[PDB]
Amino acid sequence: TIGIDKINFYVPKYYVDMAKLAEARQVDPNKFLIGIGQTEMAVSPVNQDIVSMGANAAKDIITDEDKKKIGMVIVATESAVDAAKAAAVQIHNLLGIQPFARCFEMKEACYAATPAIQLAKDYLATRPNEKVLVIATDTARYGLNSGGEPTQGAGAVAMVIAHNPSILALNEDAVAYTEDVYDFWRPTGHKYPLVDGALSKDAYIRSFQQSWNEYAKRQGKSLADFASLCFHVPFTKMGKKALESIIDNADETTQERLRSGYEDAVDYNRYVGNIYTGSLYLSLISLLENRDLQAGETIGLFSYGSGSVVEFYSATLVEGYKDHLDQAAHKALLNNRTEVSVDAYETFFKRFDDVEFDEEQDAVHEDRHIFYLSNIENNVREYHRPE
Amino acid sequence: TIGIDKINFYVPKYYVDMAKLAEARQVDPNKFLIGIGQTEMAVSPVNQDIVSMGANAAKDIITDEDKKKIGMVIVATESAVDAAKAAAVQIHNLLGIQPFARCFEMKEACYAATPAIQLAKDYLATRPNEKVLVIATDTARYGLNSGGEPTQGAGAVAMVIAHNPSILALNEDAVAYTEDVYDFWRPTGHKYPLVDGALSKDAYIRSFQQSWNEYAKRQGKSLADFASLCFHVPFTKMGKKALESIIDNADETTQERLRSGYEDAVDYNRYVGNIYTGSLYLSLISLLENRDLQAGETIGLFSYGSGSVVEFYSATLVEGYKDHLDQAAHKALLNNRTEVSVDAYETFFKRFDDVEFDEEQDAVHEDRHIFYLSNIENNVREYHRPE
Numbered sequence: 001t002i003g004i005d006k007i008n009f010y011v012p013k014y015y016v017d018m019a020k021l022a023e024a025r026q027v028d029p030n031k032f033l034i035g036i037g038q039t040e041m042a043v044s045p046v047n048q049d050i051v052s053m054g055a056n057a058a059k060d061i062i063t064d065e066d067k068k069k070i071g072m073v074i075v076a077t078e079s080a081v082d083a084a085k086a087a088a089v090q091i092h093n094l095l096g097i098q099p100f101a102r103c104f105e106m107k108e109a110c111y112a113a114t115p116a117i118q119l120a121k122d123y124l125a126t127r128p129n130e131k132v133l134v135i136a137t138d139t140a141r142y143g144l145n146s147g148g149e150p151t152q153g154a155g156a157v158a159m160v161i162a163h164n165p166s167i168l169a170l171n172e173d174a175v176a177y178t179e180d181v182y183d184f185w186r187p188t189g190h191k192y193p194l195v196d197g198a199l200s201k202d203a204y205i206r207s208f209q210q211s212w213n214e215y216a217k218r219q220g221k222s223l224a225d226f227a228s229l230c231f232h233v234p235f236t237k238m239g240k241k242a243l244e245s246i247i248d249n250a251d252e253t254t255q256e257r258l259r260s261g262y263e264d265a266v267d268y269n270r271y272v273g274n275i276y277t278g279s280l281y282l283s284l285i286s287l288l289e290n291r292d293l294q295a296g297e298t299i300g301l302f303s304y305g306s307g308s309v310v311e312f313y314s315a316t317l318v319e320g321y322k323d324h325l326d327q328a329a330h331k332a333l334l335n336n337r338t339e340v341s342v343d344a345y346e347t348f349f350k351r352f353d354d355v356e357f358d359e360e361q362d363a364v365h366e367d368r369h370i371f372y373l374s375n376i377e378n379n380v381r382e383y384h385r386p387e
Numbered sequence: 388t389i390g391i392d393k394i395n396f397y398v399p400k401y402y403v404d405m406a407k408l409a410e411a412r413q414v415d416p417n418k419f420l421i422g423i424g425q426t427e428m429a430v431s432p433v434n435q436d437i438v439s440m441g442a443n444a445a446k447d448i449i450t451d452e453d454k455k456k457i458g459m460v461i462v463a464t465e466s467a468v469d470a471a472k473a474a475a476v477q478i479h480n481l482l483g484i485q486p487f488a489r490c491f492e493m494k495e496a497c498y499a500a501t502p503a504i505q506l507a508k509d510y511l512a513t514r515p516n517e518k519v520l521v522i523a524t525d526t527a528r529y530g531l532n533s534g535g536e537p538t539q540g541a542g543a544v545a546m547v548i549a550h551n552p553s554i555l556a557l558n559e560d561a562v563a564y565t566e567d568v569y570d571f572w573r574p575t576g577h578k579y580p581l582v583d584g585a586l587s588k589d590a591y592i593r594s595f596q597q598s599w600n601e602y603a604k605r606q607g608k609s610l611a612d613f614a615s616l617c618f619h620v621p622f623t624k625m626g627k628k629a630l631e632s633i634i635d636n637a638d639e640t641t642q643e644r645l646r647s648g649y650e651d652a653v654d655y656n657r658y659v660g661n662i663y664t665g666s667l668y669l670s671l672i673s674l675l676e677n678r679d680l681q682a683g684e685t686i687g688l689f690s691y692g693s694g695s696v697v698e699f700y701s702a703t704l705v706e707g708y709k710d711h712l713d714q715a716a717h718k719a720l721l722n723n724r725t726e727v728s729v730d731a732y733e734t735f736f737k738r739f740d741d742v743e744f745d746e747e748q749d750a751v752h753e754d755r756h757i758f759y760l761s762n763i764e765n766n767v768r769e770y771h772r773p774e
C-alpha cells in the first residue's frame with residue numbers, strides 16, 4: 001500500500017472572535033456561530049505568507065531521512081505569490097531536501113491537494129524507497145465587508161506520502177467530476193475572488209452528488225460501507241448541507257455514525273476558517289485526532305474546488321496510526337493563539353494586502369522557533385529559519 | 388508501454404520579422420538571426436488567449452473516442468489568466484471531454500509540461516483504457532524594449548498520453564534537479580518577468596549538467612547511447628550553448644550526430660520564439676518531423692524552468708510513428724501566417740496587455756475554423772467555437 005505516512009498543519013498565531021466580528025458587522029452572533037458554523041477566524045500577520053506557513057506545517061514531520069528520500073515537493077495553492085516560480089522550490093530550499101526532486105505548484109481552486117496526493121501515490125508505485133511532500137497552503141481573503149468575509153481563514157497542511165504508510169492507505173478508487181460553472185474565480189488583476197454566494201452552495205452539492213453517485217456505482221459501495229465521511233470545509237455548515245443531501249435514504253445506524261464522524265471532522269476547522277486546498281485535509285486531521293476509529297475502518301473523502309472540480313475517494317486507517325498524530329500539539333497550537341479585536345484584524349488585513357512589514361505589530365521576536373517572512377528585497381522574499 | 392500517442396502545436400496567425408525588429412531596435416539583424424538564432428517571432432492578437440491556443444493545439448488530435456477515454460486534463464502554464472480556476476476546466480469544456488476527469492493546472496516556469504506527462508504516465512499504469520490530455524500553453528511577453536524582447540513568443544503544444552503509444556514510449560529513467568536561484572521570476576502584480584539575463588544562461592546550463600550527470604550515473608549511460616537530444620528552447624542558441632558544454636568529451640561521431648539532431652530539433656522554434664512550457668515539446672515535434680530517426684532509437688530530453696527546476700528523461704521511437712505526425716500541416720501552419728510590421732506588433736503588444744478587443748484588427752472573420760476569445764463579460768471569457 002501507499003498513503004498518508006505523516007501529516008500536520010499550521011495556522012497563524014492570531015485569530016478574531018466570530019461573535020465579535022458579527023457585532024462589528026451588524027449581525028446576530030448566532031448567524032456566524034450556528035448559521036455558518038464558525039467560531040474563530042485565523043488572522044494573517046504580514047510575517048506569514050504561504051511559504052512560511054507551508055514550511056511550518058512541514059518542519060515537524062520530516063526527519064533527516066525524509067530529506068534524503070523525498071523525490072517530489074508539490075505545493076497545492078490558489079494564493080500563489082509568483083506566476084512563474086513555484087512555492088515548492090522555496091519550501092524545498094527552506095527544508096534542505098535532497099536536490100534531485102521535482103518541485104512544482106498545482107492549481108484548481110480548493111481542489112488541488114487531492115491530485116497532488118493521488119499522483120504522489122501513482123508516482124511512488126514503481127519507486128518504493130522514495131517519498132513525496134505535498135503542501136496545501138492558502139489564505140482565504142474575500143475582502144472587508146464582503147459576502148465571503150465570514151468564511152475567511154489561513155493555514156497549511158503537510159502530508160508525507162509513502163509506501164507502507166503509518167496513517168492511511170489511499171485506496172485505488174478515486175473518481176473525479178468536472179463541470180464548468182461560475183461559482184467562484186479570481187481573474188489575474190483581482191485581489192479578491194468573484195463569488196456567486198448561492199450558486200457556490202449549489203455547485204458544491206451537485207459536485208459531491210455527481211462524484212458520490214458515480215463512485216458508489218463503480219465500486220458497488222454505499223454509505224453503510226464507511227466509518228466516516230470527510231469533506232472539504234469552506235465553512236462547517238457547508239459539509240453538513242452536503243451530507244444531509246445524500247443520507248436521507250441511509251438506515252439509522254449509518255446516519256448516526258456519519259453525522260457524528262462529521263462533527264469530529266469539523267472540530268478544528270471551526271476555529272480556523274476556510275483554508276482552501278488545506279480545508280479537506282485539516283478536517284482529516286481533526287477527524288483522526290477527535291474520533292477513535294479503529295485500524296481497518298474506511299473513510300470516504302470528498303474534495304471540492306470551485307470552477308469546478310470534485311472528487312470522491314476512500315482511505316483505510318493503519319494500525320497504530322494514533323501514535324503518528326499529535327492531538328495535544330494541535331490543541332496547544334489553537335489554544336495558544338492570541339485574540340485580536342475587529343479593528344486589529346482589519347489593520348492586519350490591510351497590511352497583508354500590501355505586505356507592509358512592522359516587526360512590532362507582527363511581534364516577530366515571538367517567532368524565533370518558526371519560519372517567517374522577514375523582508376522583501378529586490379523583489380525576493382527573505383525568510384527567518386527556526387533558530 | 389506508455390507514452391506520447393499524439394502531439395500537435397498551435398501558434399497565432401501573426402509573426403514579426405526578426406530582421407525588421409532588430410532595425411527598429413538599432414542592432415544588426417544578425418545579432419538576432421545568428422547571435423540569438425531566431426528568425427520570426429509570434430505575435431498574439433487579443434483574440435488568442437492561453438485557453439483558445441490550448442484548445443486549438445488539441446482539437447485536431449482528439450477523436451470522439453478520446454473524449455470518452457480521457458481521465459485527466461492537465462494545463463502547464465506560467466501565463467495563467469486566473470489565480471483559482473484552472474484553464475484545464477475551460478479547455479475540458481471547449482473540447483467536450485467526458486465529465487469524470489481531473490482538471491487542474493501545474494506551474495513551475497517553463498518546466499511544468501514535463502511533470503504533467505510523467506505523472507500522466509504514472510497515472511495510467513493501472514488504467515489501461517484511459518488517456519490523459521496534457522496542454523502546454525503560454526505567452527512569453529518581456530515588454531517593449533526589454534532585454535528579453537527578442538525571445539518573446541506565444542503558442543501551445545498538446546499531447547495525448549496513452550497505452551501502446553503511436554509515437555514515443557516514455558522511459559523509466561527520469562531524474563530531476565532543483566536548485567533555488569533568482570534567474571527569472573514574476574511576483575504577483577508584475578505583468579513582465581523579472582530577469583537576470585546572464586544568470587539565467589548560467590542556471591540553465593548548470594541545471595542541464597546536474598541533471599545530465601545524475602541521469603548518466605543512475606542509468607549507466609553516455610551521450611553515445613542517444614540518437615539525438617532534445618532541449619528546452621528559450622532561443623535556439625541557448626540549447627546549442629548547453630549542448631556544446633557537455634559533448635567535448637565525446638567521439639567525433641556522437642558529436643556530429645547530436646549537433647545535427649539539435650538542428651532538426653530547432654527548425655520550427657526558429658519561426659515562433661520562446662513558448663515556455665511548450666518550447667521543449669514544440670522542439671520535440673520539429674525533431675520527429677524534420678529528422679529521420681528510426682523506430683527503436685532513443686531521444687534524450689532536457690526540460691527546464693527558471694527558479695529553477697530541470698529534468699532529464701529518455702523516450703523511444705515507436706514502429707510507424709511517421710504515420711502519426713503532421714509535417715505538411717505544421718509547415719502549412721507556419722507558412723500561412725501574415726507578417727506584421729514592427730508598429731503593428733507594438734500595437735498588438737499593448738492591446739494584449741489590456742485585453743482590448745477589436746474585431747477588424749484581429750481579423751476575427753478569418754478565424755471561423757478555430758477557437759478564439761470573442762469577449763469578456765461580467766469577468767467571464769467567451770469563446771467562439773470552430774464552425
Ligand SMILES: CC(=O)CC(=O)SCCNC(=O)CCNC(=O)[C@H](O)C(C)(C)COP(=O)(O)OP(=O)(O)OC[C@H]1O[C@@H](n2cnc3c(N)ncnc32)[C@@H](O)[C@@H]1OP(=O)(O)O
Nearest residue numbers: 028030031034035036147148150151197200201204234306
Ligand atoms: C470559496 C470556496 O471554498 C468555494 C466553495 O467551497 S463552494 C461552497 C462554499 N461557498 C463559499 O464559502 C463561498 C463564499 N461564502 C459566501 O458567500 C458567504 O460567506 C456565505 C454564503 C457562506 C454566507 O452568506 P450570508 O448571506 O452571510 O448568510 P446566509 O447564506 O444568509 O445564511 C447563513 C446561515 O445563517 C443562518 N441564520 C441566519 N441568521 C441566523 C441567526 N441569527 N441565528 C442562527 N442562524 C441564522 C441561516 O439562515 C443560514 O444557514 P441555513 O442555510 O441553514 O439557512
Ligand SMILES: CC(=O)CC(=O)SCCNC(=O)CCNC(=O)[C@H](O)C(C)(C)COP(=O)(O)OP(=O)(O)OC[C@H]1O[C@@H](n2cnc3c(N)ncnc32)[C@@H](O)[C@@H]1OP(=O)(O)O
Nearest residue numbers: 415417418421422423534535538571584587588591621693
Ligand atoms: C525565460 C526562460 O525560459 C529562462 C531560461 O530559459 S534561461 C535561458 C535564457 N533566458 C532567457 O531566454 C530570457 C531572457 N532573455 C534575455 O535576457 C536576452 O534576450 C538574451 C540574454 C537572450 C540576449 O540579450 P542581449 O543583450 O541581446 O544578449 P547578447 O549579449 O546580445 O547575446 C546575444 C548574442 O548576440 C551575438 N552577437 C552580438 N552581435 C552580433 C552580430 N551582429 N552578429 C552575430 N552575433 C552577434 C553574440 O555575441 C551573443 O551571443 P554569444 O554568446 O553567442 O556571442
